[PDB]
Design a protein around this ligand. Structure first.
Ligand code: ATP
Ligand code: ATP
Ligand code: ATP
Ligand code: K
Ligand code: K
Ligand code: NA
Ligand code: NA
Lengths: 431, 215, 431, 216, 215
């Protein structure tokens, strides 16, 4: 039932958001019922897939609704639910505290209400500061009326890992700009590192006092971004479409930006449709892995990938247990990561299979769209504006399951089987 | 009101089932896996944890519960160490199930708000019914006055209230009569006393015993 | 070291076979050193990928070497090694018996020498009978000199799951023929069901006395072929390239043939390059799963797929153990299947990543080639003749690891870590 | 007929193997993991479960079995609590293995359809063969009449049926003779009695003992 | 300096927490899973291993530690076999916690660099405070001279240092006075002696006892 409240509440925000975006006040042009549903779903799932341009189709009021859906969806439905109850004066019950444990993927209810206070105060603080830093650049280019709103829209979009951009070119005019690159990359890296990871760094200022999850995220993200930066820079160095007609300083900025954006922000500085096939394949594995168990990102998490990878290597080396940072990992942790990865690949496989039946498109664009939609990244190769009515409905389901997580979606309609009986062991050869 | 019950025994499991029936948020904590699975459906939240560990106790959010019941009455070491952590954690109400007289004194020193003896209090009440079969259930208002729900004998059959001089001679007041499933609150003179039904009376402890022997 | 003997012995058959195919006697045309190595590797790994046509490039003596490499590779290197020792009179030692246990993926050495006697006698018997049944059809069409050799070549090729064909069209001229379809499909289904499964049916004639592995293979293959037959028939019914200009009787034969051929024979009756993208995606999952732990097929096995799939569903339903056919499955079985699937996907991902850098080809053909090479299927979309010199060397490595298995390849160069020490448990969130 | 056997012991395991041999659907329930693995191949379905728990008992589909055999004869608490749940679950036939006289009375009160004493019934039958070595196997038709499969002695060698006045004097009827592997049903007068073979007789309990002492 | 502590008990766990507080690399080895988890945060590296096995001991990199502390004092077989492997592995410093007199002799034969009796040394020091309540803590410089931190009595109140003839008569030197939280090193004549505070004195063992009885 705590997974059922998450599924119902998250789906209702799509319906409420779709009505608000379909009003004539919130848009400058007539909008389809599916495009209004797609834009609302792409905001609460915080994906960033846009059939229609955000800057042109929607008004200032319409883009304000987008910021509301991004902020609600990025922090989670139950994050703001506790705040409303706390403001009204009602105390948090045991039943209400169990909903927070399921929403934040916590193993215990110990100190989970206070985590919501920290993560919400940290979210509004760092989005306000980043808007001020972006204000020194966006105001002289777009005045005071549009410059302040563009900084506020992008600071919320970047921190929540959305990828929404008001400009027709999604950050393609700021490839060599260090102000836009450094501030925005600082937002989704810290916004995607995990609320528990941020809470541990705030209270503990020494690396040896960090938990296993905090040390895994800090070391894992640094290693994964370094490999991704080298892979993009080497493969795209001679590419004429992207990273070719740029200076060496501008090559380092775009390679660094494209290394960290697929997890899971979905901003860009180079056209992904003109990249080589080798970089797209590496991006597929890059955006299949997310960042942070309790964060604004989606897909399988970085800790999930490390736990599975170390468990296989330990088996290949003959070790009897999974040991990371001189800490043993128990069997329930292994089987949960096994359940996340297999269910995620099964849903992605069904999405690719369903889109190939419906959409008439190159196969590389179909696979790129499905991995981006499931990971809630939003990177496109040129397929989202070309999707049919049936194709868009598949992506909405993929984005919905990807943000909520494959386990919580299944647990909504999977009745628990509580039996204490056992069975004799059977031998089956799995070579 | 949020309630936490530590130890799912015969006494602890009865509190979880009764409070959940009335519609309260109950946390069931036990160190035994089978006990937690049995009471998982009878509690709002059931956790397999050791209450003697501070790290496990803080993982339950135990600071959010006004009432914590430590229903461990066979392990003095587990019972006393649990209430020491709760007293250190500033729990407003700690109710502990004790084992004997010495266990009662240790809990009083380490700050138990209420100490309960379930088997000892029932053993005294049962022995009162064993000594005198006329009584059924009694409540001690004080050390000298009590309300006793008596059982009507054969000599009290077809007798009116005014016939019984309980008010004048024995100095006792008849409170209620359970006439074969029918209950009359504060009977007025006169009501016919039937066969072996529940007769609720109120008076001095020595005065009721005189009514049982004579009347 | 028993995995090391398998890796060295299997690689030496590639080198010996390459020299024999490179001789002027065995070929009608000059042959490249890489094409001779590719053809030799595609035969001992029993894959069937042909850069050159087998019928035209090689002579009768050259095709006899192909039959030798298929027979040696299909039954395994250590299968014939025991036969040579037994014929010479030397008794099988304990060290020699441990090599058979590793080669056949057996958990125990109990009765493993006698299994080699049964599987070798069954192999030569059913290939001789199937050659006689195919002789009644191939002799009136190709005479006695070529008709008898074509039946003998194809009976060995089909039983060992090779897909090699002497004709330029790989069984594309026998779409509606029930004689070719029924006999050949009976060969790789029974040749791929497993030597242990065949041994259990021979000694036990009642289904309730079968083991868990035998019941999994018989029920799993029947269900998987039924789903594949329905998927191919529905998707390709309106396709003009394949299954469109055929009668309803011929549609059932081609749909049934294409349902069972990707696991892992690689024969065909329809052109895979003209199929729709939806059927190719389903074929990718179809040929990623093989058949039989100790058989002539490769890739991850059917029991490996069922064990992982049931373990996830049991976790999603809240069950505490994996139960198939009222039999519990222990943790060592689960972790071995976990190691097979993750390592297989990692090697396939590296193969796709390496081929995209080297080969200039459509992305769907690259992924289809890598899954077919790793599963040793041999189905092509039109990429194998177009591979470069560097691209062919990648496929040879992929075919080598796929036939030997990802676990046995890693165990060759992975030193065992034997430590009895343990570590304290660490909590990591893998949501 | 669907049979459920609870407790895979020496007595419980013999019922599972015999019923599975005859071709019946047998459910084997035991709390011990090693017992279930040994009898997994000798039963249609083998489950590791505790029969004293109602939740575990309902997970087995125990309401679909007409005959449930509780073959627990060393744990009175486990045996009596198991049959209480089955009686509450409306099992048509409950057969319980008892331990002693007091265990027999508890099962009779809580509704046992049949109570079995395997060791006690064999101990009486074995002691009858110990007291008299002439008998081999007997069946009590009543408290005064029985069919006893006797063993031929040396004095009965080369003797005809008509020579033995079992019908007139002892009042007993000779039923069958197992002549060295050859079995004759209802022998007719006269048949020669050979060496130490099985001689099946029928008569009064006191009358057969007179034949053993005098005739045999 | 790299330290290894084998056995996380009351004595072993105190060494791990104290050395980690001072900023040293400490390896905590114990055969009990619960002990290792509790001291995982109080040690640089905590491993669940058996120290009596050479294969498990070499897996820890135990040859890289200059100081290895075998804090096992209730299992003589486990304690003596552990130090035999370490002596065979050429550990420069092996400190062993002993149990009794016979355990002390076995460790001396098999090459223990230092043998520690934690409970025996504390029992002697505690019994010295039990016999004489005037003393608080003492250190034996030799078998006849010691530094005793005495407790001021009522007769020493409002008394100057020059008034007390400790130097001439008793032959003892007053070292320090802990004046209600204020500590004076080497007091000069004269300082007023207040109420029951710590009085540090130095002298012969028999001479200090005369000062306690008389002065
Ligand atoms: N440290 C502990 N933490 C949590 N639960 C515990 C702990 N120790 C014991 N328990 C559980 O508390 C319950 C009650 O304890 P126990 O059976 O020892 O007491 P009792 O006085 O005999 O109980 P009762 O009379 O209520 O049946 C049991 O289910 C036991 O498993
Ligand atoms: N509650 C229970 N539920 C199911 N099986 C049980 C239960 N308790 C015991 N058993 C199993 O029942 C079997 C028979 O019980 P037990 O061995 O105590 O009786 P027994 O009279 O000695 O048996 P037998 O003479 O047939 O060997 C054992 O294998 C035991 O593990
Ligand atoms: N072979 C061993 N290897 C490693 N640790 C061990 C071994 N044997 C015992 N220990 C651990 O060493 C610790 C101290 O040993 P033990 O408790 O027997 O001694 P002790 O003298 O009673 O302890 P303490 O330091 O509390 O006085 C315990 O935590 C025990 O589990
Ligand atoms: K995004
Ligand atoms: K093949
Ligand atoms: Na017995
Ligand atoms: Na001690």
């Amino acid at each position: 039932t705590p997974p059922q409240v998450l599924a119902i509440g998250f789906f209702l925000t799509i319906i409420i958001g779709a009505v608000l975006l379909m009003l004539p006040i919130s848009t400058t042009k007539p909008l389809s019922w599916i495009d209004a549903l797609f834009t609302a779903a792409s905001a609460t799932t915080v994906t960033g897939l846009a059939v229609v341009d955000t800057g042109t189709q929607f008004t200032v009021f319409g883009q304000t609704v987008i910021m509301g859906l991004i902020q609600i969806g990025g922090l989670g439905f139950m994050t703001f639910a506790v705040l409303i109850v706390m403001i009204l004066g009602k105390k948090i019950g045991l039943k209400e505290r169990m909903l927070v444990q399921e929403a934040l993927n916590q193993p215990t209810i110990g100190g989970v209400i206070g985590l919501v206070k920290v993560l919400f105060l940290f979210s509004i603080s760092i989005e306000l500061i980043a808007a001020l830093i972006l204000s020194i650049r966006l105001v002289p280019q777009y005045g005071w009326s549009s410059g302040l709103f563009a900084s506020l829209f992008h600071a919320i979009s970047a921190f929540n890992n959305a990828g929404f951009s008001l400009w027709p070119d999604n950050l393609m005019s700021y490839v060599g700009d260090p102000t836009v690159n450094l501030v925005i990359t600082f937002l989704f890296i810290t916004g995607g590192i995990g609320f528990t990871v941020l809470f541990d760094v705030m209270k503990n200022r020494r690396f040896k006092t960090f938990s296993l999850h905090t040390k895994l995220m800090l070391t894992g993200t640094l290693m994964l971004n370094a490999i991704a930066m080298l892979t993009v820079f080497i493969l795209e160095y001679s590419n004429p479409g992207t990273l070719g007609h740029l200076h060496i300083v501008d090559k380092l900025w775009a390679s660094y930006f494209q290394a960290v954006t697929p997890r899971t922000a979905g901003f860009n500085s180079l056209d992904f449709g003109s990249m080589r096939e080798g970089t797209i394949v590496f991006t597929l594995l890059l955006m299949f892995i997310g960042a942070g168990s309790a964060s604004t990102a989606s897909g399988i998490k970085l800790t999930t990938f490390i736990v599975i990878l170390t468990s296989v290597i330990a088996y290949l080396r003959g070790k009897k247990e999974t040991v990371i940072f001189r800490r043993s990992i128990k069997y329930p942790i292994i089987i949960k990561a096994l359940a996340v990865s297999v269910t995620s690949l099964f849903i992605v496989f069904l999405g690719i299979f369903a889109l190939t039946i419906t959409e008439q498109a190159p196969f590389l664009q179909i696979v790129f769209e499905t991995f981006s939609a499931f990971g809630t990244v939003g990177l496109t190769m040129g397929l989202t504006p070309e999707l049919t009515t049936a194709g868009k409905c598949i992506i909405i389901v993929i984005m919905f399951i990807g943000r909520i997580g494959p386990l919580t979606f299944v647990f909504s309609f999977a009745k628990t089987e509580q039996s204490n009986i056992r069975y004799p062991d059977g031998e089956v050869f799995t070579g | 009101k949020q309630f936490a019950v530590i130890g799912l025994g015969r006494f602890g499991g009865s509190i979880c089932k009764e409070l959940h029936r009335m519609g309260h948020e109950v946390l069931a904590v036990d160190i035994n896996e089978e006990k937690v699975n049995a009471y998982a459906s009878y509690a709002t939240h059931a956790v397999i944890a050791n209450a003697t560990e501070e790290n496990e106790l803080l993982s339950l959010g135990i600071r959010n519960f006004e009432y914590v019941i430590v229903a461990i009455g066979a392990n003095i070491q587990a019972s006393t160490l649990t209430t020491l952590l709760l007293k250190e954690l500033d729990i407003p109400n700690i109710w502990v199930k004790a084992q004997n007289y010495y266990h009662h004194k240790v809990l009083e020193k380490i700050g138990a708000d209420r100490i309960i003896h379930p088997e000892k209090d029932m053993g005294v009440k049962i022995a009162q019914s064993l000594s005198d079969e006329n009584v059924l259930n009694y409540i001690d208002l004080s050390d000298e006055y009590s309300i006793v729900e008596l059982l009507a004998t054969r000599k009290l059959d077809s007798k009116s209230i005014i016939d019984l001089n309980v008010r004048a001679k024995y100095g006792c007041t008849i409170l209620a009569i359970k006439h074969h499933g029918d209950i009359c609150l504060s009977p007025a003179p006169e009501d016919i006393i039937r066969e072996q039904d529940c007769l609720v009376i109120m008076g001095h402890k020595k005065d009721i015993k005189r009514f049982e022997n004579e009347g």
